[PDB]
Structure formats: C-alpha cells, structure tokens
Amino acid sequence: GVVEELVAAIGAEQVVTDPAVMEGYSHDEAEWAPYDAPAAVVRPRDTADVAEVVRICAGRGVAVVGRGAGTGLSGAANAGRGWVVVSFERMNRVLEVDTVQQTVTVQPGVVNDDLRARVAQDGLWYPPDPASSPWSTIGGNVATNAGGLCCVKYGVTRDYVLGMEAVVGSGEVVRLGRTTAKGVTGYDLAGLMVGSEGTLGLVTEVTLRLVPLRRGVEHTVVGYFDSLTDAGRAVAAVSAAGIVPSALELIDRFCLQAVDEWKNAEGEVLLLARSDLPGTSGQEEADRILECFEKEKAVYAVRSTDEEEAEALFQARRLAYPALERLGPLLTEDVCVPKARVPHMLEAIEAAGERFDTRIGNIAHAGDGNLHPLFIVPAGDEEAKRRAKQAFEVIVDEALAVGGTVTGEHGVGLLKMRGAADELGPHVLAMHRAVKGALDPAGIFNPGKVFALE
Amino acid sequence: GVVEELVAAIGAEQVVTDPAVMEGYSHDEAEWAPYDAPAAVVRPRDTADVAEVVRICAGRGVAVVGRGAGTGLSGAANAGRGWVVVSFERMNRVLEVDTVQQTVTVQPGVVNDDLRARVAQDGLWYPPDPASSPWSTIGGNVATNAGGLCCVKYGVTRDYVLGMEAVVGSGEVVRLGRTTAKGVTGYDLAGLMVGSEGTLGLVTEVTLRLVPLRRGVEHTVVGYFDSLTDAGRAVAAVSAAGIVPSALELIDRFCLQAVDEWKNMGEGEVLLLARSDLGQEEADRILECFEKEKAVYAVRSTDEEEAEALFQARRLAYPALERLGPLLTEDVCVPKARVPHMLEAIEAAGERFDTRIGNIAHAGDGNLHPLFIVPAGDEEAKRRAKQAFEVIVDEALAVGGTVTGEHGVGLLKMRGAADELGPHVLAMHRAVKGALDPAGIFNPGKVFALE
Ligand SMILES: Cc1cc2nc3c(=O)[nH]c(=O)nc-3n(C[C@H](O)[C@H](O)[C@H](O)COP(=O)(O)OP(=O)(O)OC[C@H]3O[C@@H](n4cnc5c(N)ncnc54)[C@H](O)[C@@H]3O)c2cc1C
Ligand SMILES: Cc1cc2nc3c(=O)[nH]c(=O)nc-3n(C[C@H](O)[C@H](O)[C@H](O)COP(=O)(O)OP(=O)(O)OC[C@H]3O[C@@H](n4cnc5c(N)ncnc54)[C@H](O)[C@@H]3O)c2cc1C
Ligand SMILES: [Fe+3]
C-alpha cells in the first residue's frame, strides 16, 4: 500500500501512476542507462510534502530518486522498478535575492537560465553555466555539482553553494550549510550534499553566492587547427604562459558542421578562447592568447573584432550535443585529466578510434582539461556499438593512467560506475558505503548509483 | 604498554615522553581550554609513520589528536589525558609546484607564509592569508578552514583545497579529492575533511589550487571614525555601493594602542582599512563612502608604503594583545546587514557586564572578533566576560549568523555550536564520524559531543 499512503499523505494531485505519464519521469537523456517502471511519480508542493514522502518510503524500504529536469547524461536520475520518483517541478520559485548580502535562495526546481535572468535584474550574476542551462534545474546542478563553460575562470556549482535545506534519514528536514560569508561550524555537510547525485538526501532549498555582473566587452580569440594534437598543445601553451582565459573550448570538425545542418569550418579543430578583462587590460590579454595560437600550429588564428560572429561560434558550442542527438543515438564520455595531458589525451582518443574503427568527435573544456568525446552510434551495426563500448573503456582507463578522473561534471550515475570504482579504490568506496549508511540508514535515497552497497 | 608499541614502530627519536617537552605539544594558543598530559608526542617523518600511529591507537582505542603549529584559538589542538599528539613539525616540505596545472602539493607542517613565498618564485599566488600566516601550518588551515584578510574577494581555504591524502579508520592511508581542475567522481570526502579539525582523520598531504600573481598597485583607502556605530554604517555604505573590496578590516582603539605600545610606531575610535585590487576609480568610490559617514582624516591613500605600514598593525593586533596578559577571543559571523546592529550589540554587552571589549573584524564578511583582556587576580571580570560571551553569541545566531566564522568550534565554542546546529544536524555529525572513525580515536570530544 505504498501509493495508498502517499495519496493519504500528500493528496492525489501529487501522486501519479499512469504508466504513460511515468514513462518520461524514470529516465534521463543518458541513453543505454537501464530504467524500469516506478511505483509512482510524486510532484510535491513544498518541503512538507517531500518530508512525508521520505518518511513513508523509509519505513516501507522503497527506493526514492529525486528528479530535476531529467537532463543528466549518466542515468543518475533513472528510476528502478517500483521506485518513487520525486519531481521538483512544482518547487520552482526564487524565494529571495538579498542585494546587500549578494545571495539568492532558490528551490530545487528552478531552471538555471531562469535563475541567471532574475539575478541579472539586480545587477548580480550566477557564473555556473552548463550547456543544459536552458533546461537543467538548480537541484540537478547541485546534486551532480554541474559545471559550465566559464567554469575555467569562475569555478563550478560547488563554489557557490552556501547553504541548503534537505530531507534526510527517516524524513527529517534539516538546514545544512551557512548563509553568511564565513562559517566553519561543524562539518561541511552542505558541501557533502553537492556532488552526491541524490544518494544522501533531497535538496528542498539552496542558498547560492552571487557576484557583480561583468557588464563589459568579451574579447574573443578564435583559432583553427588541423590536428587534435597540435590544438591540444596550444591550450596547454596558453596555460603554461600563466593565462586564465574566461573560456577555452575545443570543437572538432564532425561536431560543428552538424550544428549548421540544424540551425544553418576553416580547419579540423576549432579552439575558441575569450577574455573578460575591462579596458585595454583585456585587449592586452586577448592579444597574448592570439600569439599562443600562432606560435603553435596556426591556421586562421585571428582575434575577433566582431561581437556577434564570436557569439555565434559560442552558441554553436552549446548546441553541439542537442544538434547531434537529433542525428541519432549519441554516446558521450566525460573525463578530466591534467592540463599538461590534453595533447596526450587528444592524440590518445583519436588513436582509440582507429583501433576499434569508431569515428569519435571531440569537444572539451580545454581550460580545465575536461574532455567530452562524443560517438554517434549508427543504428543496425551492433559491432560499432560493441567497438565503441570497448573504446569507451580505453579513453577512461587512459585518462586514469595520466592522473585524471572518470567524470568531471556529468556525474558517475550508472554509466561510469566501473571507471569510478577503479579510480576510487576499495578504501575510498568503503568510505562511501559508510557515509551513505550513516546519513541514509534506510538505504532508500537513489540506492545503487555512483557506487554499489554489498 | 602503548608508548612501547609506538617506539617499536617508528623508532625512538620520533617519540617523546619527557613531561617537560610534551607541555608545548598538548595545548594551543587558546587559553582556558582544558588540556592534560598526553601519553606521548609523536613527530612522524613520512606517511608510513603516521599510518603506524593510527593503526596502533586504533586497535588499542587510544585517542590521537593531530597538532600543527599550536596557534588555534578554540583548543582544537589541545591534547587529552593519555592521548597521542601527532606533531607534523617534521612533515614541512613543499613537495611540488606544477606550473602548467597551476597547483602546489604541500605537507601539513608547512607554514602559510612559507608556502606563499615559495609559489611566489614561480609567479604564482596562494590567496588565503590568515593573520597567523607567519607561524600557522597548512595542516592547521585545512583542519579549521582558516580565513584571511583577502577572503572577502578570494574566498577561504576550502575554496583552494583540490585534494589531500589522509590516514583514516584503523590506519588505512587513502587519498581523497582530486588533482585536476574539475572532479565530481563520487562524494566530496575531501571537502568533508576541511573544517573537521582533525575529528575524521589526519591530513598528510594537500593539493591546493593557485592563481597568477597580482602584479599591480593596490589602492589603499584608510579611514577613521569615532564610534563603532557610525563606522558600522560606513561598512554598509561600501556594501550598498556594489563594491567588492579586496580588503576591509576594522580595529578598535585598545587594539591600536597595544600595537603602538609594542612596536612603538605611529587619533580615532575605529580604523576601517579598505583596499581595491583592480582601480583608482573604485578606491575613489570607497573614499566618498567614508566621508559620506562620520569621516576623520578619510583619504584615499596613494602612498603604497605608508598604507602597507598601517596593515601591519591590523595583522599584529592579537600578538600585540597577548603580551598584555590572558586574552579570551570570540569569533562570530553575521550577515553584512547586521554588522552595524551587531557592533551596537557588542558595546552594550560591555556596559551591561562591566567588561571592556575590544573589536576587530572583517567587516566585509561580517566576521567579528571581539577580544577581552582578562586581568590577573580579578576572577569576577573573567566570569563577567563569559556572560557577555554568551550574550554576543546568542545575538549572532538570533540575527542569522553562525557561532564561528574562521576559528572553528574546537572546545571553547561547543556550547554555541550545539545551539546553532540543532539536534538533527548534531545527530548527523555523530553518525558521520562513526562511519569514518569507528574507533572514535581522532580528536574525540571536540566540535561535538560523542555522548
Ligand atoms: C545537452 C546537454 C548539455 C549539458 N551540458 C552540461 C554541462 O555543460 N555541464 C554539466 O555539468 N552537465 C551538463 N549536462 C548534464 C547536466 O549535468 C545535467 O543536466 C545537469 O547536471 C542537471 O540536469 P537536471 O536538472 O535534469 O538534473 P537531473 O538529471 O534530474 O538530476 C541529476 C542528478 O541529481 C539528482 N537530483 C536531482 N534533483 C535533485 C534534488 N532536488 N535534490 C537532490 N538531488 C537531486 C538526481 O537524482 C540525479 O542524481 C548536459 C546535459 C545535456 C543533455
Ligand atoms: C595570532 C593568531 C591569529 C590568527 N589569525 C587567524 C585568521 O586570521 N584566520 C583564521 O582563520 N585563523 C586564525 N588563527 C587561528 C588559525 O586557525 C590557526 O592559526 C590555523 O588554523 C592553524 O593553526 P595551527 O596550524 O597551529 O593549527 P593547530 O592548532 O595545531 O590545529 C588546529 C586544528 O586542526 C587540527 N589539525 C591540525 N593539523 C592537522 C592535520 N595534519 N590533520 C588533521 N587535523 C589537523 C588540529 O588537531 C586542531 O584540531 C589565528 C590564530 C592565532 C594564534
Ligand atoms: Fe560540459
């Protein structure tokens, strides 16, 4: 009688059982991630509803997986058979914007882009800008510690989580973290929630840190290359010069030429960089970045004196994944290695394609060494699927061999549990099982993702 | 028979038992914090030695309390009777400075200022600059999540900790966190160590993120006031102008006197020292904010040296007051909008309890440091200050602040810490510590109670 207690606790408008409606609430954009039919999909109204849902599911031992917008790429939000999917679509209000403290308090259902537009009205700015910003929730960004494009100079979500309110344990609603500028009272439990991917609790309200709007001119330094190796050597060349570019992205040829077909290519690798320093200070730095592209392999390495053709190339970098998803199933990998390993990793990925006869596109946050190789899977050719799945295990192990990480921003979820286990090791994993057990003694919060419990 | 197992594990020259020597290892600069004679003070050489100390005490259930430079202000490093003090004095080497990744790898025993000067050679910079930087260890800065003067614009220690290696549990050497620029694999166990004050493990190596050197001329904006109330409104003026200053510090009268009566170098009640890191247009905007409020000799300083001399008194305020006797310090942090109100509350706590309370605070972040000098022989004033101590704290939580901003709960703040966190959150601390420290040997009893 799980659905019976839920309706009797939070009403009927907050429980859904139509197998047709629950279809889309149990899987995210991560393809090949298994997902089964959940027992019911709850859409709570406020923290009180979530507290009751967690309490009921805790006693009955029913797995509950929180869901934001369902734009994950590792199946972290995917629901298991009989689970209770908690959709925060109804908790989508920005509660306050304190201009003196320069902080904002939002609900987990808020959309990233919507949040940024609201704070910009008060002259503030929320730096984190994931490619899925137009559709991802702040709840998801906090659960997966999502990153963005400008995170090479302003950090990721974790760098802006001051405090939060979460439902944990048997249904206790607690307020973790702080709201002032400095606080060390107790443990960093608020930070412990960030990057947990909903395996330790449920965030019902988060307090974010803000910054003044950049109200300025973005000097773009555009560069083209003919090889992923040379272009990789240039990104490291700028980082060795000691420059902190406000953006440094790589878009191979296969990816950029596809976006044109959708929305309507000087070289093989397009290295897009940009700086945001005011006045000539930025122009001086943007010029320095240009030389780094020219000194290395340089094809059409020119600084952009146009505020739109620059912005048009960057809008293509954002529409790279959705432009290729319409082109068929797309398997994506997220590794992050040291900046000095970008050339070795780029040439190592390209080599991985020839060994398994699999064409692999490349886009990566060159500023942080976070590579995103994307493979478009042709339908009908199972060997290509199999060859790409084994190449999947080569790029991962190769990134761990140079000292990288199995995931940089997308989250372990399900499609990266193998690599995550090899990176963390038995001791680190054992600590995860212990931590999750103390804060989730019922084992109901998204059990089985990131790491396994046995 | 515990000391014997230790000596039989890490040699004799790494174990000390002389009760005359262990004194300097069993208590920190936090006075009135309880401390007893430890069973031995271990000075490890490498992670292997630290691993042995943890394994031995884990099986025997002997409490171990890690110690850095002993500059804590809440008794976090104070040792309990029969404990084993692990001193990282020997682990004080900078292991690597990766200029391509722009990161540094340090051991816990390294001093803050030493780490900064080291990275300065390679054109890098470590922003976090606590007042005790010249003699505090990086191991301590990570356990307490220390702050500094520039943290109003560059964050605190936790904002630069990329990864670490620690000995947890029964003595397993694990490396938490990452070393790249981005990493989200699993939980943030590294961030969990930060601010734990050594209650979940022992950090033997930390990987900190760095930034390019400033390489510019700072625009210092010095300002004088005649009261903590009027000056408080000036601090809000910079906040009401959308200005993020690289530094904003406030010092009281008795603080300045002690600095001029010690260093003998040198007029106002409070002195707000502002600074920008852009730039003259911003420094000028702040100057007008001071004259907008009660302004005495408010001038946007162009002499970078004379201003730099003024910032030496702000950092030498506590060392200049400890020479005048026992100094009990409180560390509250409230929202910026409560700085003026909170300052007026501190003054009343003095009049109400007949206690002279000096004030220095990072007004830019709302981190207040009211310090009382306790005279010798007048125990009445000591207990009277303890009552104003409970009043200034409750007023910090009532207005939405926190019991501790940068110093840490330790021991002299566990009362307020419990009131702030609450039963639910406290029950979580005992649960977390239990999972990662099933033996309960890592500084047990501090921060929260293991009742
Ligand atoms: C086209 C595209 C571009 C992308 N670009 C980026 C990018 O640039 N950077 C990046 O980091 N990621 C990117 N992603 C994936 C992205 O990380 C996720 O979309 C984003 O992190 C959040 O999406 P979401 O709102 O759907 O969260 P969801 O997928 O719903 O949830 C993700 C995780 O968070 C947990 N969770 C959700 N809500 C809550 C809550 N309220 N409380 C606690 N836990 C919760 C979920 O259970 C799951 O574990 C992209 C995805 C797509 C499809
Ligand atoms: C004069 C003065 C000025 C100060 N100014 C500031 C300031 O501006 N900002 C600020 O934030 N703080 C300040 N402090 C206190 C500051 O927190 C300490 O100076 C700093 O935290 C480190 O001191 P320490 O290295 O002696 O740490 P210790 O006191 O030795 O240790 C502090 C806590 O950390 C734990 N710990 C230490 N090393 C390890 C380790 N290797 N692994 C695990 N746990 C460990 C200790 O056990 C203890 O719990 C000041 C202190 C003084 C005395
Ligand atoms: Fe991305």
Give one DSSP letter per residue of A356-388, joined into a string.
TT---EEEEETTTTEEEEEEE--TT-HHHHHHH
Angle at A39 between CA A38 and CA A40, to 5 degrees: 90
- In angstroms, how far is the first alpha carbon of chain A from the final one? 28
Nearest to B181 among A101, A369, A428 (CB): A369
Whole-angstrom CA distances from A432 to A435, B204, B293, B395 are: 5, 21, 53, 38
* Number of Cβ atoms within 10 Å of the Cβ of A449: 23
* Spatial separation of the C-alpha atoms in residues A411 and A127, rounded to whole Å: 20
The Cα–Cα gap between B294 and A108 comes to 44
- What's A341's DSSP letter? G
**Domain B219-398, what architecture?**
3-Layer(aba) Sandwich (3.40)
Ligand 1 pocket test: which of A26, A136, A314 has the largest number of ligand atoms within 8 Å of its C-beta? Answer: A136
Q: Which two tokens stand for residue B102?
A: 């722009």
Nearest to B441 by CA among B2, B28, B110: B2
For A2-89, CATH number?
A: 3.30.43.10
Contacts of B99 (CB under 8 A, 6+ apart): A240, A242, B122, B123, B124
Q: How far apart are CA B167 and CA B50, in angstroms?
A: 7
CA distance B384 to A39: 61
| Contact between residue B139 and residue B203 where contact means Cβ atoms under 8 Å apart | yes
**Token code pair at residue B374:** 């306790």
Residue A130: burial class (beta carbons within 10 Å; 0-12, 13-18, 19+): buried
Distance between Cα A397 and ligand 3 center (Å):
20
Q: How far apart are CA B239 and CA A445, in angstroms?
A: 41
**Which residues, in sequence order, are bridge partners of residue B371?**
B329, B358
Helix, strand, coil percentages (3-state) for chain A, rounded to 5, are 40, 20, 40
Residue A312 burial by Cβ neighbours in a 10 Å radius (0-12, 13-18, 19+): exposed
Helices (H) then strands (E): counts for chain B: 16, 19
Distances (CA, A) of A428 to A76, A200, A432, B119: 20, 16, 7, 31
Structure tokens belonging to residue A226 = 């003919």
Find the DSSP H helices in A11-135: 47-60, 112-121
CB count within 10 Å of CB B114 equals 17
Ligand 1 atom at shortest distance from the alpha carbon of A141:
21
Distance CA B171, CA B9 (A): 13
Q: Tell me if A203 CB under 6 Å of ligand 1.
A: yes
Q: Is B80 in the pocket of ligand 2 (CB under 6 A)?
A: no
Cα–Cα distance measured from residue A450 to residue A411, given in angstroms and rounded to the nearest whole number: 8
Contact B181 A339 (CB under 8 A): yes
What kind of experiment solved this structure? X-ray
Tell me how far apart the alpha carbons of residues B377 and B390 are, in angstroms, rounded to a whole number: 22
d(CA B222, CA B286): 10
C-alpha A192: how far from chain center: 17
Q: Is A431 helix (H, G, I), strand (E, B) or coil?
A: helix
- Strand stretches in A210-350, DSSP E: 211-212, 219-225, 247-252, 269-275, 299-303, 330-332, 335-336
The CATH number of the structural domain formed by B92-212 is 3.30.465.10
Alpha helices in B61-101 (DSSP H): none
Beta strands A247-252 and A269-275 are: antiparallel
Note whether B123 contacts A242, CB cutoff 8 Å: yes
Q: How many helices (H) and strands (E) does chain A have?
A: 14, 19
- One-letter amino acid identity for A439? L
Sheet containing B103-106: order of strands? B94-98, B103-106, B202-209, B161-168, B172-177
Cβ atoms of residues B118 and B133 within 8 Å: no
Fold of A219-401: Vanillyl-alcohol Oxidase; Chain A, domain 3 (3.40.462)
Using a 10 angstrom Cβ sphere, with 0-12 exposed, 13-18 middle and 19 or more buried, the burial of residue A227 is middle
Q: Please name the residue that has the structure tokens 């804590």.
A: B72
- Lookup: tokens for B379: 């125990």
Q: Which ligand is nearest to the CA of A65?
A: 1
Ligand 1: does its nearest atom lie under 6 Å from the Cβ of A139?
yes
Chain-centre distance of CA A231, in angstroms? 24
Beta-bridged to residue A330, according to DSSP, are A376
Contact of B412 with A163, CB cutoff 8 Å: no
| Resolution attained, angstroms | 3.0
Contact A435, B168 (CB under 8 A): no
Tell me, yes or no, if B423 comes closer than 8 A to chain A by beta carbon.
no
φ, ψ (nearest 5 deg) of residue A167: -100, 120
Q: How far is CA B258 from the centre of its chain?
A: 22
State the greatest distance between any 2 C-alpha atoms of chain A, in Å, as a whole number.
Answer: 69
Under 8 Å between Cβ of B231 and B225: yes
**Annotated domain spans of chain A:** 2-89, 92-212, 219-401
Task: Judge if the beta carbon of residue A137 lies within 6 A of ligand 1.
Answer: yes
User: Residues near A51 by Cβ (< 8 Å), separated by ≥ 6?
Assistant: A167, A171, A172, A173
What does the DSSP 8-state code read for residue A158? G
Beta strands in A278-333 (DSSP E): 299-303, 330-332
Distance of CA A452 to the CA centre of its chain: 22
- Beta-strand ranges (E) seen in A229-289 are 247-252, 269-275
The residues near B427 (Cβ < 8 Å, ≥ 6 apart) are: none
Q: Return the structure tokens found at A271.
A: 């290295």
CB atoms within 10 A of CB A154: 19
Assign B340 to helix, strand or coil.
Answer: helix
Token couple for A168: 């944990």
How far from chain centre, in Å, is Cα A373? 15
Q: How many CB atoms lie within 10 A of CB B287?
A: 20
Q: Is the dihedral of CA B126, B129, B135, B141 positive or negative?
A: negative
A239/B180 Cβ within 8 A: no
Cα(A204)–Cα(B343) distance, rounded to whole angstroms?
Answer: 34
Q: What is the DSSP letter of A111?
A: B
Q: How, if at all, do strands B270-276 and B247-251 pair?
A: antiparallel
